[PDB]
Every structure is written in C-alpha cells, then in structure tokens.
Design a protein around this motif. Structure first.
Motif, PDB file in Angstrom:
ATOM      1  N   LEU A  43       7.360   0.425  15.315  1.00  0.00           N
ATOM      2  CA  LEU A  43       7.918   0.965  14.234  1.00  0.00           C
ATOM      3  C   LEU A  43       6.487   1.670  13.783  1.00  0.00           C
ATOM      4  N   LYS A  44       5.952   0.298  13.337  1.00  0.00           N
ATOM      5  CA  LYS A  44       4.020   1.137  12.601  1.00  0.00           C
ATOM      6  C   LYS A  44       3.722   1.653  13.549  1.00  0.00           C
ATOM      7  N   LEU A  45       2.860   1.497  14.862  1.00  0.00           N
ATOM      8  CA  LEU A  45       2.981   1.807  15.678  1.00  0.00           C
ATOM      9  C   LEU A  45       2.894   3.242  15.252  1.00  0.00           C
ATOM     10  N   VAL A  46       4.512   3.586  15.548  1.00  0.00           N
ATOM     11  CA  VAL A  46       5.186   5.061  15.728  1.00  0.00           C
ATOM     12  C   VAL A  46       4.956   6.055  14.747  1.00  0.00           C
ATOM     13  N   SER A  47       5.226   5.343  13.775  1.00  0.00           N
ATOM     14  CA  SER A  47       5.279   5.662  12.280  1.00  0.00           C
ATOM     15  C   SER A  47       3.157   6.200  11.981  1.00  0.00           C
ATOM     16  N   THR A  48       2.567   5.114  12.599  1.00  0.00           N
ATOM     17  CA  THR A  48       0.900   5.717  12.539  1.00  0.00           C
ATOM     18  C   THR A  48       0.871   6.630  13.306  1.00  0.00           C
ATOM     19  N   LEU A  49       0.959   6.354  14.725  1.00  0.00           N
ATOM     20  CA  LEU A  49       0.635   8.248  15.835  1.00  0.00           C
ATOM     21  C   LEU A  49       1.498   9.047  14.977  1.00  0.00           C
ATOM     22  N   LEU A  50       2.708   9.182  14.830  1.00  0.00           N
ATOM     23  CA  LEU A  50       3.503  10.308  14.381  1.00  0.00           C
ATOM     24  C   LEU A  50       2.650  10.748  13.039  1.00  0.00           C
ATOM     25  N   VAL A  51       2.642  10.288  12.513  1.00  0.00           N
ATOM     26  CA  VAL A  51       1.578  10.958  10.787  1.00  0.00           C
ATOM     27  C   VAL A  51      -0.046  11.086  11.628  1.00  0.00           C
ATOM     28  N   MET A  52      -0.534  10.990  12.186  1.00  0.00           N
ATOM     29  CA  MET A  52      -1.309  11.073  13.031  1.00  0.00           C
ATOM     30  C   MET A  52      -1.222  12.000  13.821  1.00  0.00           C
TER      31      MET A  52
END
Lengths: 98, 985, 107, 126
Positions: A43-52
C-alpha cells in the motif's frame, strides 16, 4: 538514481492485486507472517507511485476497482474496504482516499 | 572491537538526523568510514543454483587392492547458454572424492554454490582455470576459451603417482594436480547451472571416445561392478521425486577403498585331530564318486590315454588308484577343507556309530558304460538335510576360498575389468565374494555343499559359533513458525522402504545431534521394531511393512498422542489406545521424522485433504484437522545437516569451561581451558578442535618486508601468539597452529598425516614447470616432536607461533627454541589460530595473546583501530569456538529439474538442464561464507542486526542525499530489490 | 596500465575507433572479489563513446584494445582508476579494479 | 608367488631343433601340471602338450610334428624339444603352472582359475 517506472508500476499493481486475492481467501500463512506485513509495504508503494503521478488512466481504474468493485464501476470479488484490517492498513487507505 | 551490536547502529542512526533536519557532514562521514570496507557488515547478493552429476564409477587404490590405477573418460558439450539470468553459466568437469564431497543446493562457502573444485576433495576444469580449494588458477592451453558447444574434454587419472590431467580438443592442458590425499574412492563428476547440455562418454557400449586414450589408461566403463548396471545419479540428496510426491530420503551407503582388498583367514598352519587317515580318505572317495558321476552324466568317459576331445578320463579305473600327485591333490583338498573348518568355531568329528556302512552307496542306474563307473551315491541329503546354520557355514567356506583366491590373484598382479582380457592380466571375477554376482556364487558352492552333506552323514559335530553416527541419521522437522499449542492435528507418513524410521511430534528446542526419543524433547514412534520413545524405549504396536501409512494425531485438549497403522489404532501391551498421555503443552509441538541409512519415506502433512489417505477411516469424524490444511503454500521444512562447523562454546557446557584472565603482572591477557568433570564418573574424553573467532589476513602484495625499539615496532609486520600446555597434560596429544576458514573435519582419530594437501603445478609447452603451489586447510605443529626431544613433567610447554603478513611465511618455536617446521602461504589469505587437543588433565591449554621484542601482538593484526598499539589486549569480540559436527539447515522450496537419459551406444549419456533457479544469499565477511536469506526466519539475532543495518542505510540516505543514494545503489542494486519485493517467504 | 585477458573469442577484425558508439555489458568488482558493478542487474547495456573521456582511461584503453563480440577481463591499476580520490562509500582510496567486459553492437 | 621363467626357442629354419627350458620358482606346494600355451601373432591361443607330475602327458592338435616334453619335479624344470618345424608354428610360447592335476578338478572354478602364468618366449619359424 534511475529505475524503470513502468515495469515497477505494473509489478506493484500485480502484487497489490494478488495480495488482495490472498487476503480474500483466508489462509493461515499470510505473507510476511501477518496481514499488516502483507499489506502495509504494498500500500505504501502504491500510494507513493500514485501521488508521484506514474499511474495511468487504466491503472487508476484498476486501483479503484480493487478498493471497491461496487462503487467504482463503468457500464464475487471482495473490496479492500469490506474485509477486516488492522489500523496501519486503515491509515494507508486513508492516505489513498486523501 | 565489541561485536555486532544493534545499539551502536541506533546511535549512528540518531547521529544522522534529528528533528527532521539532516546533518550532511555526519551522513557523509558515516558513509565514508563504514561502507567502503565491505567488512563487519553482512552483505547481500543474488546467486544461481549449481548441481553435480556423477557416472556411478568408483575407483581407488590401496595395499593389495583388486582395482586398476589409471583411468580416463570423455565429456562432450552440445548446448551452452552464456549469461542466463544476469550471471555467467557454471560448468566444470573433473574428479571428486567419495568422502568429504557432499555439496548442497544453496548456501555454501564462497558467495555461491560450490560445485566442483570449491573444496579440497574435488578437482575440476572449466576451460580456462584449474579449480581447487575454492581457488581458481589460470592455465595455458592452445585453445584458451570457456567451455563452448562442440567442445570435447578428456579427463584422466593416475593413482600410482597422484596426478590428474586434462586435455581439451586434443590440445594438452599445461597444468596438473599432484600429491593429493588418496583416501577414499574417486569418481567422475560434472557441475553445472541451468542452461547446459553435456554428454558423458565412457567408451565401449556407452559412448565412443573422440580421441584415443593415452597408453596404459583404461576406459571408465570397465570399472563397473558386476552387481550393478550403469546409471547416472546425483552425488548426495535428501529428497527425491515420485508419483506420490516429494519422497524424503535418508543417508546412502557407500563403499570404501579398503573394501576391495581380500582379508581371509590363513589355515595352512592349522593342525588337525587324528581324522585324516580315518575319514579324510572317505571324504576324498565321496568327492571322486560325485565328480565321476558328473562326468558320466555328460559325454565324458574313461579311456586308458588321457584326451580332452575324445572324452577320456586319465585314471580310467573304478577306484581312483591315482599316483602320489593326483591322489594327494584330493588329500590336500579335504585337508584344507578340514583346516578351514577348524580355523572357524566349528569342531570336526566322526561320531556317527558306523553310519558310513549304513549309507546306501548303491544308487547306480547302470548309466556308466566303461571302467571308471559304479560311482556309489551315499544319498546323504536324503537321510539328513542341511540346517540353515549349515548352509551359512557353507557360504562362509566358499567366501574364504574365494578370498584366498583373490589374494593370490592380487599377489601375481591381476586387476579387475568389466571385460575379460587374459593377456592384460584382467579378470572380471576377482572382486571379493560379497561383491560377486550370484551365478559365480552358486558355481563356487555346489562342491562345498556336497562335502558338507558328507560331513553331516559321517557324524560331524561342527556347530557355527562417533563421526559415522551423525552420518547414519537424518532428521526432517517442520519449521519453528508452525508450532501448535491448541487444537487437534493429524498428519501421515508412508514407509516406502521398511526399517530404521521414526516419526512423531517434537519440540521447538529439539537438538539435531540426539536421536529422536532419547531425550524428553520428542514423542516418537519407531515402526521398524514397533516401539514408542519419549525418554527411553518401550514396546508398542506392531512393526510395519513396505507401503504402510502411519497416521499421527495429537490433541492438546486431552494432552494425548495417537498412532494408527493403516487405519487401525495401535495399542500398547495393556491395551491403551493412547501412546502417550499427560503431556504438558509447553512451547508447542512440530511434526518430525527421522530416517536411517538407505531409507526413503513420504511425509504428507495434508495440504490437500483429497490426497490424504485413511483420513476418513479415522480422524475425519473424530474432530481432528489435518496439519497445514488451509495454508496456500507448502510447509517449509528444516533438515539435520552433518557438515561440521565452528560455533562458540556455550557458557553452560557441562564438561568444558573457558576462563578469561588478563592484566596480571608479567603475564599478557590469556584464555584458559579447563575440564569440569575430569577424574570423575560420567565424564567423556574426546578430540576437541578449538579456534579463535577472529582471523588475520595477509597483504595483497608480497613485496618482501630488553625494551622494544620504537622504529622497528612501527616498521615491523610480524605477529606472535603462544599456547601454553600445563603440567599433567600430555604434549603428544596437542596440535597448535592455524586453520583456513574452510575446515570441516571432525575426525576422532586425528593425525598430522590426515590433513588435506594438494600441489597444483603449471608447466610450459615443453614440460618444464615454473610454478608449484601447495594448498591445504590446516598448518599446525605437533607437540609430540617437541616432547620427544626431551612421565609427568612439572615444566609447562610453551609453543609460540610467529606470522609475517608481508613476506607470507609462518614459523613455530617451542620453549624458546626455533623449530625446523615452517610454512608458506599465498596473498589474500586469512587464518584463525587453532589448537586440536585430547584432554587428559583438569588443566588443558592456555591461549596467550602477548608480544615479544620487536614483534607486535595479534590484537593489531585482528583489529584495524589498534594497528599501531603495542599494548596487548583482549576485546570482547575475541572468543574461543569449538567444532560441532551436526547443525540445522533450511530445505529449499524449489530444485533444479535435471534430465538424464542415454542418447545411444555411440552418443553416450546425455544430461541437460534449462530451467533457471536463483536465490538471495547473505554473506558474513569474517567467516567467508554465505547462507540463504530465508534462513534468517530462525536466526533472530542476525535478522535484527540486518534490519537495523537497513534502517541505517535509510538514515544515511534520508532527506535528499542523492550522492549517498548513488553510493548505496552499489551495495543494494535494482535486481536485489525487485527480487525481494516479490519474495513470499 | 590495463591488463587484458581474453575469455571468449570475438569477431577479430571489427575493432572500434575514435568517435564511435560502443555498448558493453560488464561486471565490475574489487581486487578481493568484492562485486560493486554489474550492468546485467539493470538489464541495460552501458553506452559510451571513445574520445570524450566520459569513462576512465583504463576502461577506454581496454575497450579499444579488444574487438567486437569478445569477452575479456580487464585489470585497472589505480593510477588509471580513480586513484587516491576514489568514490566515497563505494571504492576504497587505493585499489585495482577487475572488469569482465563483453563488447557487442559496435556503431 | 610362482614365477615360470621360460627361455629358448630361437629363430630357426624349417626342420631345425629347438630347446626350451621352463623353471618354476616359487612355493613347492601345488607344483604340478606345468602345461604349455602358444599365442600366434594376432591369432587364438592354443594348448601345447601338457605334462604333469607322475609322467603324465596330454597332447592336442598343436603337438603336430616332433614334440618331446619332459619335466623334473626336483627343480621344477621342463625341457621342451621341437625337432621339426613348420611355418605356422611361429607363436609366443608360455609355460604355465596350474594346481589342477591331469586336467581334472573336482573342486570347481576357484581352483580352475587358480593358475600361475609365465613370461614365455617367442618362437619363430622361417
């Protein structure tokens, strides 16, 4: 440092999908030893890639379907919100909804 | 100086950043002073898997052995895929030793899989380097390139003088091994990774040699034993594939070089009771009667003149009437027979009450038509048969005769071959009687059977009268993360091969050294002899048969364990169904099984209930759930590996104690070994292999190089350390020196001649050698040599070892006297101080870490921070470790799919592998060895240290330090991160 | 200087010259066999040009000495390497570099 | 160990007389049946007349011509004489001692294979 972003995004999407599927089908050996260890890093990786902003329209649609297949649909599977989760996962999905 | 402490890592992390503001200077200093060394911090990488295959041909030499020295075989390459899955493909061909060469998938020493040439028991070649002792030495060949497709390698072995030579495409290889240990048997071996295709050529029926063998070198296919057929098999394995599933296999049984020699019992000097003229003549007459009857049955007859084509017996008289030589032949026949009987526990006699007259001696169907007929048949078998002990006695008599025969055959100079060759002095039947086929076994027994029946009829009253322990057992248990503390559980175990198997429920703290059920840490059932073990032994149930499934159930609500055989509950003598009762839950229980030599089994935990047999018969409706039913992935299991390794001495060891005394007057810091229970009951004495936990490393380049002189102290490179042997401890049982990281010998009869040693020599085109490097794993001196120079002497024995990290040589002294023994090594070598001792006193040995005049102490060599400090000291990291024979290892989840099948009589035997398989390895710098990262699931200290190391990496990379991120990218690369992202275990 | 030793033979005639583009799959390591560089992990060949001194001099000499399709090992002594002012956190301030290079797709 | 040194049988023309001396040095036990074999170059190995202790001589196909074979047990010496010669007689002759008496052996294969070969010598006929 540089890293292939498209391949990373596809890998993260597939990992999140398979993690959701494994969470739906209850098992006694969750990845990492617990549900929190299974869900929080992905979830952390997905959120980081989404906000990026790496994810595209189709990837965003797939993420929305994963979060809730009923609310987010365009004219069975259990959404991430329906299943019982610990508080860390709740924080991660709160960030996603933000 | 203190060790691996995560609190220091936390201190560094707090140093890096505080209150959301990054201090760049601290981050840069930490990165510069911690990362470049690549030591004291565990390393991670990705490696491939390596598998080895052998042709099942064992050859060796010994005193009086029946085997042949020179041998030679061929290996051809069809397909090679360079750089498959980001790593160069591994492919080596060579010879391996039966004892000491036990590679395992994953782990190992040296940043990856071992294969051929990564230990001092195997020697290999890969087209550009000679591989031995995990060291590669370049070699010169007319064709200098890696093993390519359509390349042929000729490998030969000479045992008269130790030397292994290679020849690529006819072009000779200029480098050769020499002076290697000859103990054990040598066999061909090829090690490879995924993406290779090779083919063995052993000549004769199996394959054709591309190039002719060198003169005097026999083909490998001639060394196959008569009892077995040619077949490609792996070296060693703890599992196999079958229709039921993964079959757990126990240790295998292997031959020895001393097995081939014949060891019979001499009987010529044996005297005999006064029975020769009384009954030996009668036995000879009976032999004549039977033998003449056999001739009469065939076309043989008895003419006055001896002839073979005319079928004419020489004597041609009814009574043998032989002259002195011919008659004495059968006289010595029966005399040697009686001598062999008397040599054993059998005692001869003639107490039969004239049963010879009572014998029929009239079975004459008048089939004879000439002089030497009328051969009476006593019908001795009809009167009395042979007891099973009597048949066994016949068997050992035949074995003794065959053994003495093999003894003279070796004496004249005969050898064994799969093909008979009289001019070459090769005979396919001179192997020991045990190794012989059943046809010749029957051929060399009928006459002895007839003679023994004759003896029975005549009234004869003859009446017939540590290290390996670990290697004969193998334990497989469930991982400690699957411990169950509640509920009712069931699993199944199928015994494919009956015998020496023990299945049950163990505890998390179960040791691998102790047998199952010997200690209170396991409740187990043995079906070979039908008993149950919790602490001791007690009969229970019935023995099983081949293909029998035993179901084990445990209920921690009733605190009981139940074993069922083929669906029926086993009961004890009193009739109780429960094998065990009143069991405290404690820390939980785990499935466990133990297999002996040459045993196979199938452990079905029950992931799929459909495959679980006999579950519905008993357990399904009783409320028992199959173990590991709802989990998605198969259970990871841990097995008992028998590879000795050095581990720290426990502080609570009952027998041995270590004292740390330092700072005394006129005495440097020292560590003393003591025996706690010496001179008392329940005390064990045995060889002890001790080493220091920190090594000393030689320089990369060997560019030569009262109060102490400061200039020499600053300019010196030599180092000193001493070992003191106390009074009362025998100097004849101490060995003092240095050990390389790869030392895994736990011999209980250790001798200075049992150490590994091999000299690799490089030659030129004309054969003039220019380099000869000796390689070993143990450089020690024996105290026996020093004491022999000269009961219990009150004076202690001080042996000081001097090393030079610049010149590259080590010297040894005793009692201040220089010794003739000296050793030379190669650059980039690290050696741990070590002593091998057999305790014989309460006080055993003392490691003294001191210094001499103009010689600097070992603390500077061990620790970089105190390189220029002459004051001796013993930091807490320095510790004494002892060798341990058995340990635990993690079974890999996936294994390579090696396909072996004979291509044809002219093509040989083909081996191929194409499915990639990679693993992530964690490497310890100081010990120079690596293990699977998943093995950290049970090592909770290394896991914590590595987690704090990752936290430190994040701390130094924190808050936009892109240069530090670039530096970190070299340590942890993209491939490792991507692999770890999807790592489900 | 740079010592070159062949591992697998190459084309043998198509040698690179100044002003061309060469792609290389290499694997760098320390003298003690401590790996620090590998282009296979990134799954992308490293592209460079001879004549703009983008890479160290020893690497240029090793690449230009060997031909197309050749796998060879290069040993770079420190004076042609980074020398005393090495990479902080990656390379010690005094070490020789071992590279396993393989030239392909010369342009 | 029983070693049978065989010397003689030099090159001679047809009809020449050849003397061959075979001496079996070894343990006196099981000294008997000092037989003779001959292997022609690149051909099968045939059996020459075999003499055993007790003045027993067994002949075969290869004994054609003038063959006189005599043995002495006092010093284990066999004096083979070939007075005639034929071109086919060229072969490598071997003197072999076997414990089997007169070609008979009721023991079995262990004693049948109990044989002691010798160095032998090359006999050539022009």
């Amino acid at each position: 440092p540089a890293i292939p972003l498209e391949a990373l995004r596809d890998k993260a999407l597939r990992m999140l999908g398979e993690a959701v599927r494994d969470g739906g089908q209850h098992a006694r050996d969750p990845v990492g030893g617990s549900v929190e260890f299974q869900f929080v890093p992905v979830l952390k990786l997905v959120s980081t890639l989404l906000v990026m902003g790496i994810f595209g329209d189709e990837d965003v649609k797939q993420i929305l379907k994963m979060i809730e297949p009923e609310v987010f649909t365009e004219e069975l599977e259990e959404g991430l919100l329906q299943m019982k989760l610990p508080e860390s996962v709740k924080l991660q999905m709160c960030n996603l909804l933000e | 100086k203190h060790g691996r402490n995560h609190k220091v890592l936390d201190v560094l992390c707090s140093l890096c950043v505080c209150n959301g503001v990054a201090v760049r200077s601290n981050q840069d200093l930490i990165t510069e002073n911690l990362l470049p060394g690549r030591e004291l911090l565990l390393q991670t990488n990705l490696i491939n898997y390596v598998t080895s295959i052998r042709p099942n041909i064992f050859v060796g030499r010994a005193e009086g052995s029946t085997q042949y020295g020179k041998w030679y075989f061929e290996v051809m390459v069809d397909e090679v895929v360079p750089f498959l899955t980001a790593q160069a493909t591994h492919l080596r061909v060579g010879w391996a030793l039966t004892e000491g060469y036990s590679p395992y998938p994953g782990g190992g020493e040296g940043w990856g899989g071992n294969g051929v040439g990564d230990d001092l028991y195997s020697y290999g070649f890969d087209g550009l380097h000679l591989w031995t002792g995990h060291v590669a030495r370049p070699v010169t060949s007319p064709g200098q390139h890696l093993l390519a497709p359509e390349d042929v390698v000729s490998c030969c072995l000479d045992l008269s003088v130790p030397s292994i030579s290679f020849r690529i495409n006819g072009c000779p290889v200029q480098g050769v091994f020499e002076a290697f240990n000859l103990d054990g048997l040598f066999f061909p071996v090829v090690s490879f990774s995924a993406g290779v295709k090779v083919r063995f050529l052993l000549g004769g029926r199996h394959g054709e040699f591309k190039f002719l063998p060198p003169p005097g070198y026999a083909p490998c296919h001639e060394a196959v034993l008569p009892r077995e057929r040619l077949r490609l098999e792996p070296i060693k394995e703890y599992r196999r594939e079958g229709p039921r599933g993964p079959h757990l296999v126990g240790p295998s049984r292997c031959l020895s070089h001393t097995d081939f020699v014949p060891c019979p019992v001499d009987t010529v000097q044996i005297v005999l009771p006064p029975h020769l003229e009384r009954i030996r003549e009668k036995l000879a007459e009976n032999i004549h009667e039977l033998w003449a009857l056999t001739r009469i049955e065939q076309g043989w007859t008895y003419g006055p003149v001896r002839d073979d084509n005319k079928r004419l017996h020489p004597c041609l008289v009814n009574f043998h009437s032989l002259p002195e030589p011919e008659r004495n032949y059968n006289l010595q026949m029966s005399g040697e027979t009686l001598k062999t009987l008397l040599a054993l526990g059998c005692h001869v006699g003639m107490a039969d009450e004239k049963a010879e007259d009572n014998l029929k001696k009239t079975k004459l169907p008048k089939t004879y038509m000439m002089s030497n007929g009328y051969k009476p048949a006593p019908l001795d078998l009809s009167h009395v048969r042979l007891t099973p002990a009597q048949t066994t006695l016949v068997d050992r008599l035949a074995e003794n005769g065959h053994n003495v025969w093999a003894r003279d055959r070796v004496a004249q100079g005969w050898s064994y071959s799969a093909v008979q060759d009289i001019p070459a002095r090769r005979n396919p039947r001179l192997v020991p009687y045990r190794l012989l086929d059943e046809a010749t076994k029957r051929s060399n027994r009928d006459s002895l059977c007839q003679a023994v029946r004759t003896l029975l009829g005549y009234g004869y009253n003859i009446e017939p009268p540590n290290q390996s322990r670990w290697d004969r057992v193998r334990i497989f248990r469930a991982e400690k993360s699957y411990t169950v503390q509640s509920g009712r559980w069931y699993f199944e175990f199928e015994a494919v091969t009956t015998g020496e198997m023990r299945v049950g429920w163990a505890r998390p703290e179960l040791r691998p050294d102790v047998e199952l059920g010997a200690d209170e840490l396991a409740y187990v059932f043995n079906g070979h002899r039908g008993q149950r073990w919790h602490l001791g032994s007690e009969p229970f149930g019935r023995p099983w048969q081949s293909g029998d499934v035993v179901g084990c159930m445990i209920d921690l609500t009733e605190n009981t364990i139940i074993f069922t055989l083929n669906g029926e509950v086993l009961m004890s003598d009193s009739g109780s169904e429960t094998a065990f009762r009143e069991i405290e839950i404690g820390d939980g229980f785990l499935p466990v099984c133990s297999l002996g030599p040459g045993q196979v089994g199938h452990l079905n935990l029950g992931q799929d209930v459909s495959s679980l047999r006999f579950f519905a018969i008993c357990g399904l409706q009783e409320g028992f759930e199959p173990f590991a039913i709802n989990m998605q992935r198969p259970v990871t299991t841990w097995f008992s590996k028998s590879l000795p390794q050095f581990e720290p001495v426990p502080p609570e060891h009952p027998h041995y104690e270590v004292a740390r005394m330092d700072g005394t007057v006129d005495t440097p810091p020292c560590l003393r070994l003591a025996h706690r229970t010496w001179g008392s009951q329940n005390s064990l004495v045995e060889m002890l292999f001790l080493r220091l936990s920190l090594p000393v490393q030689f320089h990369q380049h060997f560019r030569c190089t009262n109060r102490d002189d400061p200039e020499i102290i600053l300019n010196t490179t030599t180092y000193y350390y001493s070992v003191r042997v106390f009074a009362g401890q025998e100097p004849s049982c101490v060995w003092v020196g240095w050990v390389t990281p790869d030392y895994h010998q736990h011999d209980m009869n250790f001798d200075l001649s049992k150490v590994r040693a091999v000299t690799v020599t490089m030659g030129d085109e004309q054969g003039n050698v220019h380099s000869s490097l000796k390689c070993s794993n143990c450089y020690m001196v024996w105290g026996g040599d020093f004491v022999s120079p000269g009961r219990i002497s009150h004076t202690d024995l001080v042996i000081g070892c001097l090393v030079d990290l610049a010149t590259g040589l080590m010297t040894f002294t005793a009692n201040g006297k220089e010794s003739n023994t000296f050793f030379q090594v190669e650059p980039n070598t690290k050696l741990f101080p070590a002593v091998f001792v057999l305790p014989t006193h309460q006080n055993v040995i003392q490691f003294e870490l001191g210094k001499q005049k103009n010689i600097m102490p070992l603390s500077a060599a061990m620790f970089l921070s105190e390189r220029k400090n002459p004051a001796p000291q013993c930091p807490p990291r320095l510790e004494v470790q002892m060798l341990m024979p058995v340990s635990w290892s993690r079974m890999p989840n996936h294994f390579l799919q090696v396909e072996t099948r004979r291509a044809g009589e002219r093509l040989g035997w083909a081996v191929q592998c194409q499915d990639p398989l990679t693993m992530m390895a964690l490497h310890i710098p100081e010990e120079n060895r690596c293990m699977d990262i998943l093995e950290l699931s049970e090592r909770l200290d290394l896991q914590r240290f590595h987690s704090h190391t990752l936290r430190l990496y994040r701390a130094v990379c924190a808050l936009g330090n892109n240069r530090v991120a670039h530096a970190l990218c070299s340590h942890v690369d993209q491939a490792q991160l991507l692999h770890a992202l999807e790592d489900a275990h | 200087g740079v010592e070159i030793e062949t591992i697998s033979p190459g084309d043998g005639r198509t040698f690179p010259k100044k002003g061309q583009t060469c792609v290389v799959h290499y694997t760098g390591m320390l003298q003690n066999g401590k790996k620090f560089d590998s282009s296979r992990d990134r799954n992308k060949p490293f592209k460079f040009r001879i004549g703009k001194q983008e890479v160290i001099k020893g690497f240029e000499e090793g690449a230009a000495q060997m031909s197309l399709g050749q796998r060879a090992k290069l040993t770079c002594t420190p004076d042609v390497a980074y020398g005393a002012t090495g990479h902080p956190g990656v390379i010690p301030p005094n070490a020789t570099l071992i590279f396993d290079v393989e030239l392909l797709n010369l342009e | 160990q029983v070693q049978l040194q065989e010397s003689g049988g030099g090159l001679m023309q047809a009809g020449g007389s050849l003397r061959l001396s075979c001496t079996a040095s070894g343990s006196i036990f099981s000294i008997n049946s000092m037989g003779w074999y001959r292997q022609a170059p690149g051909k099968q190995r045939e059996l020459v007349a075999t003499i055993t202790s007790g003045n027993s001589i067994n002949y075969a196909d290869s004994v054609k011509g003038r063959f006189t074979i005599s043995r002495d047990n006092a010093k284990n010496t066999v004096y083979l004489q070939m007075n005639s010669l034929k071109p086919e007689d060229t072969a490598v002759y071997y003197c072999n001692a076997d414990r089997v008496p007169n070609g008979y052996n009721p023991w079995g294969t262990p004693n049948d294979e109990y044989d002691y070969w010798g160095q032998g010598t090359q006999v050539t006929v022009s």
